[PDB]
Amino acid sequence: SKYEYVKLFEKENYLLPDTYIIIRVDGKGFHKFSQFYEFEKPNDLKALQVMNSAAEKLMSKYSDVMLAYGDSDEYSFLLRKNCQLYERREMKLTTLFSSLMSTYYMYFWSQYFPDKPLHIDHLPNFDARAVLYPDFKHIRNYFSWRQVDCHINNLYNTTFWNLVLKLKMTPQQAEQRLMGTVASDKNEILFKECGVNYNNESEMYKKGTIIVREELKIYHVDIINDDSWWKSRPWLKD
């Protein structure tokens, strides 16, 4: 054929072999999404259950996924160094992960929220990106990074929304109130001003969600400083 030549312009990226692969998916414009569908704030439990359901189903479908961590609108999946899925093609992996997360999210949404049918102009969408890590210490530091981010964002949001919801403040007002404030200040604001003990908040909200292949087990725990949690799971490294 005289038109097939265009196929030669395509460029495939084969991810470096024997390297841990992390795929992170993140919901597109989930702020506006949370606004439209009236999520409970700071954290909507059922929505996170939809996310976790999607992640668990996906992880159940692909044996190569060793570990999953997610919070808010994001989820990260660790693939074993030797994973041969789609011959380690970056494009296949990423677009497939985004498609799967989107569709699973839609399905489990139809299951958890029959009262809120999805509108065509607001559908859950996710991006996805692949990152290569040559050493497991970097994997540990990655998930540590994600959990710390969950910590910061959840604290910020809880203080913010308690200022907005429990107090009568405006989003702008609450935003300006927290400017240049650090974690300790946020907690003090929560207790003294909002009468809220952050430590008593749900373990899922503050620590995030971990899905591990053991069986697929779900935990909400600190993975940052607990070495024994990792040591007892050597198959993650292999």
Contacts of 101 (CB under 8 A, 6+ apart): 25, 54, 55, 58, 75, 126, 128
Among 17, 165, 176, 197, binds a second copy (CB under 8 A): 17
Tokens for 21?
């692969």
Given the complex with RNA, which of 114 and 119 has the nearer CB atom?
A: 119
Distance CA 105, CA 94 (A): 16
Kind and range of the H or E run holding 178: none
Tokens for 74?
């994001």
Among 53, 57, 85, 133, binds RNA (CB under 7 A): 85
Distance CA 223, CA 58 (A): 22
Q: Is the peptide bond before 42 cis (omega within 30 degrees of 0)?
A: yes
Among 45, 145, 166, 218, binds a second copy (CB under 8 A): 145
From a second copy, RNA, none, interface partner of 175 (C-beta below 5 to 8 A by class): RNA
Distance CA 60, CA 44 (A): 24
Tell me if 134 contacts a second copy by CB under 8 A.
yes
| Shortest distance in whole angstroms from residue 178 CB to a second copy | 19
Tell me if 92 contacts a second copy by CB under 8 A.
yes
Question: Quick check: 208 and 69 in contact, CB under 8 A?
Answer: yes
Distance CA 181, CA 178 (A): 5
Among 135, 197, 221, 227, binds RNA (CB under 7 A): 197
Tell me if 180 contacts RNA by CB under 7 A.
yes
Among 62, 85, 96, 222, binds a second copy (CB under 8 A): 96
Given the complex with RNA, which of 228 and 232 has the nearer CB atom?
A: 228
Residue ranges in contact with RNA by CB under 7 A: 1-2, 4, 26-32, 62-64, 73-74, 84-87, 89, 148-149, 151-153, 155-156, 171-172, 175, 178-185, 187-188, 190-192, 197-199, 201, 206-207, 222, 224-225
